[PDB]
């Protein structure tokens with residue numbers, strides 16, 4: 001069960017993720033700072049999820065069911081069509097395809113550990129960012 005309100009405890013390689021997607025330095029710096037203490041709300045009902053991630057300047061709300069395509073944005077803010085699957089019991093993986101144009105291959109994963117941590121990974125081609133959260 002991923003449901004709850006989550007707070008960040010670790011972040012690794014976020015600014016570089018943005019950098020390889022081409023994000024300019026002014027915007028990268030604003031984004032990393034804005035996301036340093038995010039609010040993440042998840043409501044899980046079986047395979048149905050609601051995930052709201054808020055930084056100081058942005059809020060994103062996704063609604064999806066595992067196995068059903070949905071629209072979101074890439075981490076750099078480009079609209080995409082996404083599809084989540086269960087890789088294993090505690091771990092979901094998301095493939096993203098841009099709605100318009102082409103770009104680096106992006107994806108994300110979310111997994112719950114036995115100690116109750118939520119691990120988010122985000123990838124752009126060969127660059128990986130890892131963020132870890134715990135429940136409030």
Ligand code: NA
Pocket residue numbers: 020124125126127
């Ligand atoms: Na790369």
